[PDB]
A paper describes a structure:
In mammals, dephosphorylation is assisted by one of two known regulatory subunits, PPP1R15A or PPP1R15B. Addition of G-actin strongly stimulates eIF2αP dephosphorylation by PP1c–PPP1R15.
To better understand the catalytically efficient tripartite holophosphatase, we sought to trap a pre-dephosphorylation complex for structural analysis. A cryo-EM map at an overall resolution of 3.96 Å was reconstructed and one copy of each component, PP1AD64A–PPP1R15A–G-actin–DNase I–eIF2αP, was well resolved in the map. The crystal structure of the binary PPP1R15A–G-actin (with the bound DNase I) also docks comfortably in the cryo-EM density, and the continuity of a composite PPP1R15B>A chain is readily established in the consecutively docked crystallographic structures. Density consistent with a phosphate is attached to Ser51, marking this as a pre-dephosphorylation complex. The Ser51 phosphoryl group, which occupies the position of a phosphate ion commonly observed in other PP1c structures, interacts with surrounding PP1A residues (His66, Arg96, Asn124, His125, Arg221, His248). As expected, the M1 metal that is coordinated by PP1 Asp64 (and aligns the attacking water molecule in the wild-type enzyme) is missing in this PP1AD64A mutant complex. The ‘Trp down’ position, observed in the pre-dephosphorylation complex, is stabilized locally by hydrogen bonds between the Nε atom of Trp582, the PP1A Glu139 side chain and the carbonyl oxygens of Gly97 and Lys98, bringing the helical assembly into a conformation compatible with substrate recruitment and catalysis. Binding of G-actin to one face of the helix presents its other face to the conserved β-barrel of the substrate, enabling several interactions: PPP1R15A Arg591 is buried between eIF2α Met44 and Tyr81 and forms a salt bridge with Asp83.
Author numbering:
A (entry chain E): 5 to 182
B (entry chain C): 560 to 618
C (entry chain A): 6 to 375
D (entry chain B): 7 to 299
E (entry chain D): 3 to 259
């Protein structure tokens, strides 16, 4: 399941990608935050062939953060740009990716106990937990993470969630194992 | 350093409109559809052969 | 190179094989002047088609020569195609193979005239006729499944197995796009608004397309409509006036599920889908249940995916794996599927060629196109 | 072939609000194409030119800037022009640009000269816009006519044995000028060899000798490589056009080389200047610069 | 020939069965009538008007109607109604007033120009120029009419041109001192048949708003002196002041050939 309520990124966000293949017209990439849907990164700058484009392909083991240049929700395309990300902008992306991944990892163990098999079932769990904090605090990503850390000291944060006693214990357990 | 400076400002109209072209955003939106045929071809063709094309209306 | 011309009741979708979207989308309308006259700076026109025909409808008698999916007037239809090739795509038909699309269960006599016109009147080098529902399935990238193709004029359920329609299971519901628009116009009128000028009558369709949705729980929201503070939304008219729309947002597409609202005794789309599966061989139902693909513009309403999921699970055997696929591209899925089919290398020997027609005659269409 | 009516219609729209299209007939542009490819084949592959002239760099389809560019240095024949290529990709009106240049080539074949850029290559302008641009506004059969003229374009020029001009740069295989004259046309751009190298290499301030080129299909060369070639033939500093530089021009070897890029506000993504070099009758060099908006 | 500005001539006004009756009676008096200020986006009113007139015989009236003209959202058409048994249309064209996007077009509502064939009269070829002036641009637009005459000469080799329509001409719109700026009046080529003293307003004001202006030797000698006058349809049809305004705020201007 994706990390956030919305199914597509907003124009101008910088997102992290995995480089999947090299073709004539660019690199196909997977958005790590959006359930691995496929995007693209336009040709970085100037001009280039495919022969030495593999020296530009070290991102496959680097997972660069790139900015969304165009979206078309109807057609399904996401175009991205590497060239416009500054090093200072990049530092936040590494931090954001680690933070958002942490919420996922907490919830992924949650997903195992109830044995979800369909993405929409997993999303609804998210809708009632991680995404409640994201919406309540109008801070995508950061909201869920900050609240989970607090649960060590403030257990009451799960009380307003629609959960039974059993559901609560396994969620609480996985925080302690951190 | 013989620069004849031309600090030439807008004298036509929408200066930023006639520089950034839709072609790089229409050829890119072509390949990602051009590649969809090949992935489809490896799933769509086995129903488009003369031996099987006569199978359907038989049953 | 190849052309794809999807002839629809409401909208014609035309373009080139290989392109991801149709070049031209315009109303399937041909208009002939009721009176004698000219537009300033023009010679006398005998007909207008499409966009120009819509905007001048006042002085014309409009014809929608595609009624409930079936081509029913060949004089009018000749003029829609003439407009498509020469004015909209700006191509010469003799250079380009042209794939046409046909409605499901099109009568045999109708099929033949389509082939005849293309060759003798337009001299196309090749042509093919594909069932629209089948093209829709291809574009989603699977070969087995049941298509819900619901458009402007007609809705069809078409179960498809191994690439070919199953004639024993096609159901026809005469409830589709323009019935919903008309129903909305009625109930919006009942609220105490007036759509008098043509300018004001055409916009009702726009309101439908943008703000309407299918309710997840019907019973709850019908009581909650007036009370709720968040349901009701406002749409600004072009003059400046702002009207408020309430329970009409979700009552309108409900018509799809309960045709009785407008006096049709047919069964709803959830029921017809079920009836379609049970008319097929017991051997295949597992695969149908798992591949309900929805198609066409009137299936575009937000929320319809989740509502279909629920209503079908209730009717089917308890353990059947059900999945509804609602491709984001589904307002052009018919055309796009046509674009894919005509681009395959394998498909190049399935075309009806000019040679073949000269030997066999119009009856070839049944041998080659099915 | 009435060149002036076609050219007249193209130029009448100068000064209008940008975006306005010019729609020639298919037969006319085919007419432009059919009368264009004859003069190039009749002239040498290594041109021998005379001053005075105006020199200008890459255009990349910024047609309204091309029309603005001629407003300052003088229309032919009050001053001669050579453009160095890269006018067929990314911008919005590549077609008008190339169609206008060939028409002027036919009118003034001894006063107007065009070299081949790396974008004058089927595999490139397939990717970066020009193939797609012909399909929307015209058709692909006419595109094939275009892939016939490019194969006969020249690639470099030397002014009075003192200023060496070309699109890309030097090659470790270029020992005699005869090696260039022997390359046969029409030709595609091969996957290796001299013709490729002349169109793609770039200078770099921090390499000594030969380095690896980010472009792939070619190479980089350092500061010491530059000095030896000029020295062997008793030549001076070199002026070429293929890069993007913020100032419109940028020196990189203690003023021994300048790069020209002539399209300001490049494709709406940059705030760079575009520069033109103005060379008078005595070979004195000056610069013409379009400052950012 | 008439020039009739029908205030907010649209669907609303034509659906009223009463108003339709009276409008049709007015048109039927005339063999050619120009209707101005047609605010009819999709030509529904125009269709409904021709249907009423052409119920019994389909060729009583033919039409010449324009595209919506304008710099802004407000756009009007020129609607020509003519009897095809009396005159024929050989050619029409929209005056090219230049490039709107440049901001150089001389008129907000470009005059429609129609070449007529008239077999029954002494004059064989003549032009009708249509003008609905912009209220707030009357001064500039009337001046621009000088240039329109010269254009007509080039295309058709025709000196005989009749200019008619809603000029918006009056005391406030053209004051005494401004009259000396209008070449069309100071030049003896043009006879002004509607004088300053005529009253063409249905209100109690005394304003010569509507005018007909004629150029050319041949056409001038065909005009019957003094026939140009307002037709008070209120008087002739005995109406109240309220219904008169509901129809239109302008009277027709008529002429007999
Ligand atoms: N977002 C939307 N919401 C509701 N209705 C819509 C939306 N978009 C389009 N429609 C309606 O869909 C119809 C057009 O759909 P489509 O083009 O699939 O029909 P068609 O293909 O022309 O006809 P057919 O499907 O019978 O061949 C029109 O009635 C249009 O009003
Ligand atoms: C057509 O319009 C006229 C005026 O707009 C209508 O006459 C008026 O009708 C209303 C009815 O709502 C009365 O209240 C007024 O007193 C009438 N005013 C005058 C001055 O007559 C006429 O009724 C309309 N006809 C139709 C068929 O709609
Ligand atoms: Mn280059």
């Amino acid at each position: 399941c994706r990390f956030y309520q919305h199914k597509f990124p907003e124009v101008e966000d910088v997102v992290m990608v995995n480089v999947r293949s090299i073709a004539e017209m660019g690199a196909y990439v997977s958005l790590l935050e959006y359930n691995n849907i496929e995007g693209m990164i336009l040709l970085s700058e100037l001009s280039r062939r495919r022969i030495r484009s593999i020296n530009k392909l070290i991102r496959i083991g680097r997972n660069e953060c790139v900015v969304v240049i165009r979206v078309d929700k109807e057609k399904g395309y996401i175009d991205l740009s590497k060239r416009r990300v500054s090093p200072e902008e990049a530092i936040k992306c590494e931090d954001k990716f680690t933070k958002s991944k942490t919420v996922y990892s907490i919830l992924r163990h949650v997903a195992e106990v109830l044995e979800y098999t369909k993405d929409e079932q997993l999303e609804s769990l998210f809708q009632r937990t991680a995404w409640v904090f994201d919406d309540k605090y109008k801070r995508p990503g950061y909201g869920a993470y900050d609240a989970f850390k607090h649960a060590v000291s403030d257990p009451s944060i799960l009380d307003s969630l629609d959960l039974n006693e059993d559901e609560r214990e396994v969620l609480i357990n996985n925080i302690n194992r951190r | 350093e013989k620069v004849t400076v031309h600090f030439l400002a807008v004298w036509a109209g929408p200066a930023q409109a006639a520089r950034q072209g839709p072609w790089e955003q229409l050829a890119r939106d072509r390949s990602r559809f051009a590649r969809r045929i090949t992935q489809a071809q490896e799933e769509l063709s086995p129903c488009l052969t003369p031996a099987a094309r006569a199978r359907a209306w038989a049953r | 190179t190849a052309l794809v011309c999807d002839n629809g009741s409401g909208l014609v979708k035309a373009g080139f094989a290989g392109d991801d979207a149709p070049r031209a989308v315009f109303p399937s309308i041909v208009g002939r002047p009721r009176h004698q006259g000219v537009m300033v700076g023009m010679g006398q026109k005998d007909s207008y088609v499409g966009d120009e025909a819509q905007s001048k409808r006042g002085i014309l008698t409009l014809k929608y020569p595609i009624e409930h999916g079936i081509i029913t007037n060949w004089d009018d239809m000749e003029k829609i195609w003439h407009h498509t090739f020469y004015n909209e795509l700006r191509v010469a038909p003799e250079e380009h193979p042209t794939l046409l699309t046909e409605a499901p269960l099109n009568p045999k006599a109708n099929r033949e005239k389509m082939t005849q016109i293309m060759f003798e009147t337009f001299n196309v080098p090749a042509m093919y006729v594909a069932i629209q529902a089948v093209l829709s399935l291809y574009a989603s990238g699977r070969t087995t499944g049941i298509v819900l193709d619901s458009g402007d004029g007609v809705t069809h359920n078409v179960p498809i197995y191994e690439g070919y329609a199953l004639p024993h299971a096609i159901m026809r519901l005469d409830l589709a796009g323009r019935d919903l628009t008309d129903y909305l116009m009625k109930i919006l009128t009942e609220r105490g608004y007036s759509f008098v000028t043509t300018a004001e009558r055409e916009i009702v369709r726009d309101i439908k397309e943008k703000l309407c949705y299918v309710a997840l729980d019907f019973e709850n929201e019908m009581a909650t409509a007036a009370s709720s503070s968040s349901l009701e939304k406002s749409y600004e008219l072009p003059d400046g006036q702002v009207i408020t729309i309430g329970n009409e947002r979700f009552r309108c597409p409900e018509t799809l599920f309960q045709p009785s609202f407008i006096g049709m005794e047919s069964a709803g789309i959830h029921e017809t889908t079920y009836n379609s599966i049970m008319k097929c061989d017991i051997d295949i139902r597992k695969d149908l249940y798992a591949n309900n693909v929805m198609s066409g513009g009137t299936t575009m309403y937000p929320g319809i995916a989740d509502r279909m999921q629920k209503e079908i699970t209730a009717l089917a055997p308890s353990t059947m794996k059900i999945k509804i696929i609602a491709p984001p591209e589904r307002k052009y899925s018919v055309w796009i599927g046509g674009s894919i089919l005509a681009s395959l290398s394998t498909f190049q020997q399935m075309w009806i060629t000019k040679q073949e027609y000269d030997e066999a005659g119009p009856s070839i269409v049944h041998r080659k196109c099915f | 072939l009435n060149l002036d009516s076609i050219i007249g219609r193209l130029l009448e729209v100068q000064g209008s609000r940008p975006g306005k299209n010019v729609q020639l007939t298919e037969n006319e542009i085919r007419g432009l194409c059919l009368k264009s490819r004859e003069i190039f084949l009749s002239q040498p592959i290594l041109l021998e030119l005379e001053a005075p002239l105006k020199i200008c760099g890459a255009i990349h389809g910024q047609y309204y800037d091309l029309l603005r560019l001629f407003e300052y240095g003088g229309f032919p024949p009050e001053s001669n022009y050579l453009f160095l290529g890269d006018y067929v990709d990314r911008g919005k009106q590549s077609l008008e640009t190339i169609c206008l240049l060939l028409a002027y080539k036919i009118k003034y074949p001894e006063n107007f000269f065009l070299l081949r850029g790396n974008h004058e290559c089927a595999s490139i302008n397939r990717i970066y816009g020009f193939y797609d641009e012909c399909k929307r506004r015209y058709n692909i059969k006419l595109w094939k006519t275009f892939t016939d003229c490019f194969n006969c374009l020249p690639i470099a020029a030397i002014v009075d044995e003192k200023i060496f001009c070309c699109h890309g740069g030097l090659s470790p295989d270029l020992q005699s000028m005869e090696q260039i004259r022997r390359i046969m046309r029409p030709t595609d751009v091969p996957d290796q060899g001299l013709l490729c190298d002349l169109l793609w290499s770039d200078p770099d301030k921090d390499v000594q000798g030969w380095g690896e080129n980010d472009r792939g299909v070619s190479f980089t060369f350092g500061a010491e490589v530059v000095a030896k070639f000029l020295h062997k033939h008793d030549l001076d500093l070199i002026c070429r056009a293929h890069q993007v530089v913020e100032d419109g021009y940028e020196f990189f070897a203690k003023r021994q080389l300048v790069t020209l890029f002539s399209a300001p506000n490049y494709c709406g993504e940059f705030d760079n200047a575009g520069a033109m070099m103005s060379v008078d009758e005595t070979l004195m060099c000056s610069f013409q610069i379009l400052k950012p908006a | 020939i008439a020039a009739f500005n029908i205030r907010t001539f649209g669907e609303t006004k034509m659906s009223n069965a009463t108003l339709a009756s009276y409008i049709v009676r007015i048109v039927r008096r005339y063999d050619i009538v120009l209707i101005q200020e047609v605010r009819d986006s999709h030509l529904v009113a125009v269709g409904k008007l021709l249907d009423y007139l052409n119920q019994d015989d389909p060729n009583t009236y033919h039409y010449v109607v324009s595209e919506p003209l304008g710099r802004n959202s407000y756009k009007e058409r020129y609607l020509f109604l003519f009897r095809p048994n009396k005159v024929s249309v050989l050619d029409t064209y929209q005056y090219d007033d230049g490039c709107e996007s440049c901001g150089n077009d001389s008129f907000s509502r470009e005059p429609a120009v129609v070449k007529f064939s008239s077999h029954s009269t002494k004059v064989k070829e003549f032009a009708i120029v249509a003008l609905h002036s912009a209220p707030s641009d009357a001064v500039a637009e009337i001046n621009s009419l000088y240039d329109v005459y010269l254009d007509v000469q080039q295309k058709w080799h025709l000196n005989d041109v009749m200019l008619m329509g809603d000029f918006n001409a009056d005391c406030s719109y053209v004051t005494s001192s401004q009259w000396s700026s209008i070449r069309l009046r100071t030049s003896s080529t043009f006879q002004w048949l509607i004088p300053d003293s005529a009253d063409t307003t249905a209100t109690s004001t005394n304003c010569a708003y509507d005018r007909i202006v004629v150029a050319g030797s041949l056409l001038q000698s065909s005009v019957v002196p003094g026939s140009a006058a307002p037709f008070d349809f209120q008087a002739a049809y005995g109406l109240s002041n309220e219904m008169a305004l509901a129809i239109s705020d302008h009277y027709p201007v008529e002429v007999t050939l």
